[PDB]
Every structure is written in structure tokens, then in C-alpha cells.
Ligand binder design. Structure first.
Ligand SMILES: [Ca+2]
Length: 496
């Protein structure tokens, strides 16, 4: 038993691994992004993509089984480390157990949030996991975090990459924020409290939003000060087709300026509703006029591409100025072809605006380690979450959440201030702040907008302009394979 090595692998499971399809981050990300208003997967021919895209999957869903099997696998590995260090009481080992138990709690949260239940197992053995659902599961996760807190590093006192007390508190805030959904009983007071504990910690907001998703976010202090839990990635050493490689390569295509990589998969683009988050009137979106032809030559270098885009006011920096928000990191320029905002039929990558939020360029201008894979870390946990969580919690309780909302909009140099917080403004702010970070679905569900008519976005439910689906889709089904293999599990309501 190599305690040190197993400990390290526990964290590694977040960012390393069809293999490229079944990783931790990619599977959770897809279940929380592909069916939402933020994006679309360009190749609908890919297995189960249509299902996830329009919220029409079933118990035989391959992508549901992927995330399900992956989450459980990671936990079995955490259970192994825990059984091997059980009873030990030295300071460092306790700290290691707390961090591993934090990672397991995080995994159980995914189960709870995605399936509303989980195949529960506390130790590493061969027995069949037993089902732990709803309130029972919720309380288990909360208890774990409450117990391990004292054994963890103080905020920002842990080696970059490892989880500290704040990471602990932020997850608890998120759980409390969703208590109504998971236990049927809201607990917004607690959500506010723990959110305040994180805001009261050493962590601080990065003064430049984009820098949070750049190649040097693990060395740039301005970004690190806000990154509570990073999933380390590295162009040469830590590679994963489903890691940051997914977020950068998947969102680019040959022809785009400053791709940051040699391989543009042209897979992920934004839905019209995502663009609308920055432009209430989609007519305000900078776009190349229909009657202006795109040259077939002379648009090779970034300087040539930028020159054309600038002439027509369609460089990403032009998109940002038009949106009056630093977060509007979208591309409607010509590199890659004439783009559409909304499409009458999902036919390709250009049927929507490109998202260039993630970049494989360092804020300090220095070279990155590789030409194809990004160095960019995935800031899974960010301080900003605390502000949005406290803002929502305060709002729900009848208080005034304008101060917390403004803190984020001020950071993004927004020209439009939110005077009166409303449910609509809140869910739209979650989108603007965290889009393409793998959490959208969870928030939509909390707001009662994921499956209902309360909120319709393009291509929801499979309809061009969107439509509602059965309410039982607010939870993914337990893979039919686990049902037949583990008599202890029972399918979720609504499915067959
Ligand atoms: Ca890195």
C-alpha cells in the first residue's frame, strides 16, 4: 500500500482517464450542459447525443451509464484509501483522509444531483452497494463535510490543487442551496451562512474574468486567489480528451483567430438562448451583414482575420464591448465561416456562435507547454459561486441580493447594473458567470426551469423553439445495466 501514491491518484481521477468519453469531468459536464440552454454538440450522429440534446434519453442511455459508472468507480478508489488508513491519527494522514472524504462527498453530490440517489458503499469490498437516496444521501454528504472540516488546511494554506476548508464550505453551501430539491425542504439560511464563510475566507475575486480560464491560471495569482479547487491539467504531462482539451479543442475550428491549439474539433457551440444571456435583443448581437461576402482567400493569419473582423466590428473584443460584459467571450467573426445565432435545424458547428471562454494562452504572454493540448487548469470551484449562492439564498428569503450580484457584475465591468433582483435575473446570472463549467442543469432544475414551460430555449425537448418534456426528466435514470446487476437499486420514477 503506497499511501502517498494512492492519495495522489485520488485527486488525479478528476482530470485523467471509449476512454476519452468516460472521464470524470466530461461525463458530468455533458449531463449538465448538452441538454441545457448554454450549448449544443455539433455532431448529432454521435451515439446518444440527440437524447441528451433534447432531454429524451432512457434507462439504456450510454452517456448516463458513463457518468454513473465513472462516479462509482472513483468512490470505490476513495473507499480503498480510507480503509487502508482507517484508525490512523497522525496530523498529515488525517488531513489526507479529510481531503479524500471531501472528494467522495463531491462525488456523492453528483449522484444526488443527477439521480437523486446513489449506489452507496462506505468501504472497499465486493458486496453489492445499497441504495441511499434523497434526504438520507443528502444528510450523509453534509455529515461527512461537517466532520472532516477541522482536519483540513485553512483557506489558501494547502498546496495548490488540494482542497481546503473553503472548498468544504462551498460544497455545503451548494448542498444547502439545493436542499429543497434533494430533501423537499429548503434551507436557504444555511446556504447563506456557509456562502458567507467562503466569502469571509482568504479567497478573493480575480480582477480579470478571462484570466480564470487561461493557460497560466495555476501560476497567475490574480486567478489563483479565486480558484478554490482546481483540476490540474498540463499540455505535456496531464492529458485528457475530456479535460481542458475538451473545453478548448472542442470549441474551436480551423480558421478561427488564436485557436490556442492545432486541433479544432468544432463540436461545441452556443445556443441562441445562451447568446441572449448577454443580449436581451438578439438583434444587438454583432454579426456580419448577410450581404457582405466572406473572401475565400487572404484570411490566413490572425492579423488578416482580425483586420476583417474589426472592419465589420465582429472581433470577440467587439462582442464584449457590445455586450458591455467581460464574460461575453463569444465569436461571431468570419474565421471558420459565416455563423448563425439560431438555427432552423442542427446541421453543424457554425449553426451557432463559438465560445472562446476557455483559452490555451497564458496571461503573461509566455509560451505554453504544448501545441495541441492545453495547460489550462479547470477551476472546478470558484469564489464567484459563493456570491451567486448567497445572492440567491438572500433573495429567496426575501432579502436584497443586489450587493452580491453587483460584486460579480462589477468584476466583469458590466455597464448594466442590476437594480432589482428577480428570479429571471438570477438564473440568467448563473449562466453568464458559469456557462460551460458543467453546472447549468442543476441550477435550472432548482429554479423549476429544466423540464417545464417556465423557460423554453432553442432546441429544448427537441423543438426548434423549444418545448417542455415530462417532469421525471429532472433526474437521470439509473442505468438499466445497474438495475439488472444490482437488485438493491430501483429505477427512478417516470422511466420504464
Ligand atoms: Ca496547468
Amino acid at each position: 500500500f503506497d499511501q502517498q501514491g494512492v492519495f495522489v491518484k485520488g485527486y488525479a481521477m478528476l482530470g485523467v482517464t471509449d476512454e476519452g468519453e468516460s472521464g470524470f469531468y466530461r461525463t458530468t459536464f455533458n449531463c449538465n450542459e448538452l441538454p441545457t440552454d448554454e450549448c449544443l454538440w455539433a455532431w448529432q450522429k454521435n451515439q446518444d447525443i440527440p437524447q441528451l440534446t433534447s432531454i429524451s434519453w432512457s434507462p439504456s442511455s450510454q452517456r448516463t451509464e458513463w457518468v454513473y459508472v465513472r462516479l462509482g468507480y472513483d468512490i470505490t478508489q476513495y473507499n480503498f484509501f480510507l480503509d487502508q488508513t482507517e484508525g490512523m491519527t497522525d496530523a498529515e494522514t488525517l488531513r489526507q483522509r479529510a481531503e479524500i472524504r471531501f472528494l467522495r462527498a463531491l462525488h456523492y453530490w453528483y449522484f444526488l444531483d443527477l439521480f437523486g440517489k446513489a449506489p452507496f458503499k462506505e468501504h472497499f469490498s465486493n458486496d453489492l452497494p445499497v441504495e441511499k437516496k434523497g434526504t438520507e444521501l443528502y444528510t450523509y454528504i453534509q455529515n461527512e463535510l461537517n466532520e472532516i472540516e477541522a482536519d483540513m488546511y485553512e483557506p489558501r494554506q494547502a498546496p495548490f490543487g488540494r482542497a481546503d476548508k473553503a472548498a468544504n464550505w462551498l460544497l455545503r453551501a451548494r448542498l444547502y442551496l439545493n436542499a429543497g430539491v434533494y430533501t423537499g425542504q429548503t434551507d436557504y439560511a444555511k446556504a447563506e451562512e456557509y456562502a458567507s464563510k467562503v466569502i469571509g475566507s482568504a479567497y478573493k475575486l480575480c480582477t480579470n474574468y478571462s484570466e480564470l480560464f487561461m493557460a497560466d491560471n495555476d501560476e497567475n495569482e490574480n486567478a489563483m486567489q479565486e480558484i478554490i479547487l482546481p483540476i490540474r491539467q498540463d499540455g505535456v504531462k496531464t492529458r485528457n480528451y475530456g479535460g481542458s482539451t475538451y473545453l478548448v479543442c472542442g470549441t474551436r475550428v480551423a480558421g478561427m483567430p488564436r485557436m490556442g491549439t492545432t486541433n479544432g474539433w468544432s463540436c461545441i457551440f452556443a445556443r441562441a438562448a445562451m447568446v441572449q444571456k448577454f443580449f436581451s435583443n438578439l438583434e444587438d448581437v454583432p454579426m456580419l451583414p448577410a450581404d457582405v461576402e466572406i473572401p475565400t482567400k487572404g484570411l490566413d493569419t490572425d492579423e488578416q482575420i482580425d483586420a476583417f473582423d474589426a472592419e465589420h466590428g465582429i472581433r470577440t473584443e467587439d462582442m464584449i464591448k457590445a455586450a458591455g460584459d467581460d464574460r461575453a467571450l463569444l465569436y461571431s467573426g468570419v474565421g471558420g465561416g459565416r455563423r448563425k445565432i439560431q438555427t432552423d435545424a442542427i446541421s453543424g458547428f457554425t449553426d451557432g456562435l463559438s465560445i472562446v471562454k476557455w483559452q490555451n494562452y497564458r496571461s503573461d504572454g509566455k509560451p505554453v507547454s504544448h501545441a495541441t493540448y492545453p495547460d489550462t487548469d479547470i477551476p472546478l470551484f470558484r469564489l464567484a459561486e459563493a456570491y451567486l449562492t448567497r445572492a440567491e439564498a438572500i433573495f429567496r428569503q426575501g432579502g436584497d441580493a443586489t450587493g452580491d450580484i453587483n460584486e460579480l457584475r462589477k468584476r466583469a465591468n458590466c455597464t448594466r447594473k442590476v437594480q432589482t433582483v428577480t428570479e429571471q435575473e438570477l438564473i440568467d446570472e448563473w449562466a453568464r458567470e458559469f456557462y460551460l463549467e458543467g453546472r447549468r442543469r442543476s441550477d435550472l432544475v432548482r429554479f423549476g426551469m429544466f423540464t417545464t414551460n417556465k423557460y423554453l430555449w432553442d432546441w429544448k425537448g427537441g423543438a426548434m423553439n423549444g418545448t417542455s418534456v415530462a417532469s421525471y426528466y429532472n433526474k437521470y435514470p439509473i442505468p438499466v445495466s445497474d438495475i439488472n446487476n444490482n437488485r438493491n437499486m430501483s429505477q427512478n420514477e417516470g422511466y420504464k
